[PDB]
Design an enzyme around this catalytic site. Structure first.
Site, PDB file in Angstrom:
ATOM      1  N   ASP A  10       0.838  -1.192   0.000  1.00  0.00           N
ATOM      2  CA  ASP A  10       0.000   0.000   0.000  1.00  0.00           C
ATOM      3  C   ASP A  10       0.883   1.255   0.000  1.00  0.00           C
ATOM      4  O   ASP A  10       1.623   1.506   0.971  1.00  0.00           O
ATOM      5  CB  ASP A  10      -0.903  -0.034   1.226  1.00  0.00           C
ATOM      6  N   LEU A  11       0.802   2.045  -1.071  1.00  0.00           N
ATOM      7  CA  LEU A  11       1.699   3.191  -1.220  1.00  0.00           C
ATOM      8  C   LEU A  11       1.273   4.415  -0.406  1.00  0.00           C
ATOM      9  O   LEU A  11       0.087   4.650  -0.181  1.00  0.00           O
ATOM     10  CB  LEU A  11       1.910   3.551  -2.692  1.00  0.00           C
ATOM     11  N   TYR A  15      -0.606   9.936  -5.098  1.00  0.00           N
ATOM     12  CA  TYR A  15      -0.591  11.040  -6.070  1.00  0.00           C
ATOM     13  C   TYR A  15       0.376  12.138  -5.661  1.00  0.00           C
ATOM     14  O   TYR A  15       1.096  12.694  -6.494  1.00  0.00           O
ATOM     15  CB  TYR A  15      -1.963  11.669  -6.258  1.00  0.00           C
ATOM     16  N   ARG A  47      -0.104  16.531   6.053  1.00  0.00           N
ATOM     17  CA  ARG A  47      -0.927  15.608   6.831  1.00  0.00           C
ATOM     18  C   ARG A  47      -0.749  15.924   8.318  1.00  0.00           C
ATOM     19  O   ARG A  47      -1.720  16.264   9.013  1.00  0.00           O
ATOM     20  CB  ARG A  47      -0.554  14.155   6.511  1.00  0.00           C
ATOM     21  N   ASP A 102      -3.338   2.361  -5.906  1.00  0.00           N
ATOM     22  CA  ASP A 102      -2.242   2.390  -4.912  1.00  0.00           C
ATOM     23  C   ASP A 102      -2.009   1.174  -4.032  1.00  0.00           C
ATOM     24  O   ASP A 102      -1.145   1.204  -3.164  1.00  0.00           O
ATOM     25  CB  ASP A 102      -2.283   3.660  -4.053  1.00  0.00           C
ATOM     26  N   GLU A 103      -2.748   0.095  -4.276  1.00  0.00           N
ATOM     27  CA  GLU A 103      -2.644  -1.115  -3.464  1.00  0.00           C
ATOM     28  C   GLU A 103      -2.502  -2.380  -4.301  1.00  0.00           C
ATOM     29  O   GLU A 103      -2.992  -2.449  -5.429  1.00  0.00           O
ATOM     30  CB  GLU A 103      -3.854  -1.218  -2.545  1.00  0.00           C
TER      31      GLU A 103
END
Ligand code: NA
Ligand code: NA
Lengths: 373, 373
Positions: A10-11, A15, A47, A102-103
Site C-alpha cells: 500500500d503506497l 498522487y 498531513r 495504490d494497493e
DNA sequence: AGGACCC
DNA sequence: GGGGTCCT
DNA sequence: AGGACCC
DNA sequence: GGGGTCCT
C-alpha cells in the site's frame, strides 16, 4: 492446501508522491492534490499539519495557509506509475491483485516455500523478521507458521526496497494469512514501515477496529444496515445470530461478513492483469442542459481512444453514464464491427448521442469502453 | 478474411427419433412426445396425418385417435443423444455451436479450403453438389464462391451419412455463407434432405419468408414492435428508415435486425463446448401454496447433483426460480466453499429455502447450477 | 442496467 | 473526486 | 435479477 | 413444455 502467506502493498499518499517526483521543489513543502473542489490526498508535511484526506480546498487552506496545491483531475500519470508498481510486484510472483491505483495484494505462498528449501537445518534457527511484528508478539522459531510468515516479511521488504530503488516510491506492507488480515495489518505502522501478523494476534487486530465500516468488505450501506439493528462493534457482528443477519442482507452477504469479523477470509488473490475497462468522467454542477453536453462527450472520447489505442486489445462495448439533479444512469451497446477496426470519432459520437437521447429527453458525463478482446 | 462456409445441421423430430430408436415398435406408428398437456413434437407418420408441433394432447387426439404418446418430461436421454451429435460434428471441425438440443452450426471454412488443395487443376472441373441447390439455380464452376460452397454440401452429406451410420439419426443440412442463411436454407427440403444456397439466390430466400418473426433473431416481442409501426414484410424491414427503427428498440437491436433482413449476418460460429448451466423445472398449476413447495425442490436437487456430479466441473452458483399466478422470478447466491467440495443435500436445501423465503412470504419451481469452474 | 465493494 | 472490481 | 433470443 | 444462450 492449506495456509497462505499474503502481502498487502500500500503506497504512501500516492498522487502526492507522484507529484513530488515530478516537481522536486514540492518535496518537504506541504502538498495537496486538488481534484475539483477537494484536496483529495496530501503529503505528510501537510498531513501532520492538520489536513485530512478529502478535505475542502478552502477548509484545508484555512487550516494551512501555506498549503501548495497541484491539480490531479487528469489521472494519466498516476495510472502509468500505478502499473509500473504492479509490474514490479508481478516479477516477485505472477499472482498480483490491484485494489485501485495504490494497493496490491501478492500471494507469497509458493515463493516462501521455495526459500525454505535453500535453507538447511542450521540456518533455519537464524530466520529473522523484517520490520514490525503486530502487537509486539513473541516469535516462536519452531512454529512452522511463524517461520513462513517471517520469510513473508523478508520478501515484503525486498519488494519495498525495490519499489524505492527502481521507481523511487515509498510504501507500507502487511504480511498475514489472508487478504483481510494483510490489509488490516499493513496500515498499523505508517508511512514507510511494515508489519507481520502472527496468527495468535488475529483477534487483537480484529478487535482494535472501532467500527465494522472499518472491515474491508463492509461499506457505507452495509454498515448502516447493521447499525440499524444495534450492531456497532466487531464483537457485535461476531456474536450476532446468523439468522438475523441473513434476513436483512442476503445469505450471500451474511455468511461472508460474519467470517470477516472473525478475521476469516479465504478469498484468493486474483491475477488482475490488463484492465477490464477504460473510462473517464468530467464533473460539474449544475450545467448541461443539453447540448453541448455533447462537446464534453467528444473530449472524453478523444482521451479514451488514446488509452484504448495504446493497449492493443479492442473494446467491443461502449457505455455512456449520466447523473442528474436538482446512483446514476447508464446505457451501453456493442460497438459495430466495421468501426471497431480501429473519423473513428464521428460514428462513435453518433453512437453515444443516440444513447444520450435514449436518456434524457446533470452533474456528470462519463464514457466507458469495456468488453475487451 | 473474408467469405465463409457454414453448415446448419438440424435433426428431424428429435425426441420422436430418440423414442423410436428406444422402442422400434413405435416406428411407422404415429408418435407424439407428450410433455405435460402438450404434444411437444411428433414423427412424420403423425405429422402428415394433421398433427402440428405443440398441439393440445386432446386436440392432437381428436385429429388422430390412433396417436400413440410417450412422456418426454425427463429430458435426460435426449440431452445425452444431443451431445453425441455435437461430439460427432466436432470431429469434422472443432468449431461447433449448438442451438438447443437439435441444431448445430459448424464453420466449414478452413476445412473446405483444405479439400481444395488435394484437388488438382483437372479434377476441379468435376466438383459436384450434394443434394438440393436453393431455388434450382445454375452452378457456375468458375465462380470461386460456388465451388467452395459445393464442397460444403459434400461435407454436410458426409456429416449426415455419419450421423445416421453412427448414431442412427436422420437430419437436414443447409450450407450458406452465414449462420442466418444456413439456418433459413436448411429447412427448405425436409425431412431427410439438404440444400445449398448460392449467393445470387440470397434475396430469393429472404423474401420467401412471410413474416419477420420468421428471421432467427426477431422473436415474439420484437416482431410485435415492428408490426405496431406497420412493418410486416421482410421488405418493410429492409426499406424502413434506420432512424425510426432505433427509436423503438435500441440502436443495438436496430442495427442488427435490419442487416438480418438483407440476409446479412457476420456473427461468428461459437465453440459451445461444455454447458454453462445445468437446470431443471417441474411445472403445475395452481398449486404450491407453500410447502411442500419444498419437496419439489428436493426432487430437482437430487436430479441436478447427478448431472452436476458426472461433469467433473464444479458449480459456484445456485439459483432458484419461481413463477406465480392467479416472466418469472429468481434469486441466486454463491455456493459455500466447504459444501462445494462435492449430506451435500441438507446444506443445499437450507440455501434454496432461504432463497425461497426471500421470495414469497405458483406455477413453476426450478433450480439452476451455473458459474462452473 | 443498477448496485454493492475498493481506493 | 476519478477512477477500477464483480454480482445480480 | 430481469429480459431478449433459440429450440 | 424443458430446456439452453447472452446482454443489460
Ligand atoms: Na470498509
Ligand atoms: Na424468429
Amino acid at each position: 492446501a492449506s495456509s497462505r502467506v499474503i502481502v498487502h502493498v500500500d503506497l504512501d499518499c500516492f498522487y502526492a508522491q507522484v507529484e513530488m517526483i515530478s516537481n522536486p521543489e514540492l518535496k518537504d513543502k506541504p502538498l495537496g492534490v486538488q481534484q475539483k473542489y477537494l484536496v483529495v490526498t496530501c503529503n505528510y508535511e501537510a498531513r501532520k499539519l492538520g489536513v485530512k484526506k478529502l478535505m475542502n480546498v478552502r477548509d484545508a487552506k484555512e487550516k494551512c495557509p501555506q498549503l501548495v496545491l497541484v491539480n490531479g483531475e487528469d489521472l494519466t500519470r498516476y495510472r502509468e506509475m500505478s502499473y509500473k508498481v504492479t509490474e514490479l510486484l508481478e516479477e516477485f510472483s505472477p499472482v498480483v491483485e490491484r485494489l485501485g491505483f495504490d494497493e496490491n495484494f501478492v500471494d507469497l505462498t509458493e515463493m516462501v516455500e521455495k526459500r525454505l528449501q535453500q535453507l538447511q537445518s542450521d540456518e533455519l534457527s537464524a530466520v529473522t523478521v523484517s520490520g514490525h511484528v503486530y502487537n509486539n508478539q513473541s516469535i516462536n522459531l519452531l512454529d512452522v507458521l511463524h517461520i513462513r510468515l517471517l520469510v513473508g516479511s523478508q520478501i515484503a521488504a525486498e519488494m519495498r526496497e525495490a519499489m524505492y530503488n527502481q521507481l523511487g516510491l515509498t510504501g507500507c506492507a502487511g504480511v498475514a494469512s489472508n487478504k483481510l488480515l494483510a490489509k488490516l495489518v499493513s496500515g498499523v505502522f505508517k508511512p514507510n514501515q511494515q508489519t507481520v501478523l502472527l496468527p495468535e494476534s488475529c483477534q487483537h487486530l480484529i478487535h482494535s477496529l472501532n467500527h465494522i465500516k472499518e472491515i474491508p468488505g463492509i461499506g457505507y450501506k452495509t454498515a448502516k444496515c447493521l447499525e440499524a439493528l444495534g450492531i456497532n462493534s466487531v464483537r457485535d457482528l461476531q456474536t450476532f445470530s446468523p439468522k438475523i443477519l441473513e434476513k436483512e442482507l442476503g445469505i450471500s452477504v451474511a455468511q461472508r461478513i460474519q467470517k470477516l469479523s472473525f478475521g476469516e477470509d479465504n478469498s484468493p488473490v486474483i491475477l488482475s492483469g490488463p484492465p477490464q475497462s477504460f473510462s473517464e468522467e468530467d464533473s460539474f454542477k449544475k450545467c448541461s442542459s443539453e447540448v453541448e453536453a455533447k462537446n464534453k462527450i467528444e473530449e472524453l472520447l478523444a482521451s479514451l481512444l488514446n488509452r484504448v489505442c495504446q493497449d492493443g486489445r479492442k473494446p467491443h462495448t461502449v457505455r455512456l453514464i449520466i447523473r442528474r439533479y436538482s446512483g446514476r444512469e447508464s446505457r451501453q451497446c456493442p460497438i459495430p464491427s466495421h468501426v471497431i477496426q480501429k473519423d473513428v470519432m464521428t460514428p462513435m459520437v453518433d453512437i453515444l448521442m443516440k444513447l444520450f437521447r435514449n436518456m434524457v429527453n446533470l452533474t456528470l458525463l462519463s464514457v466507458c469502453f469495456c468488453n475487451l478482446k
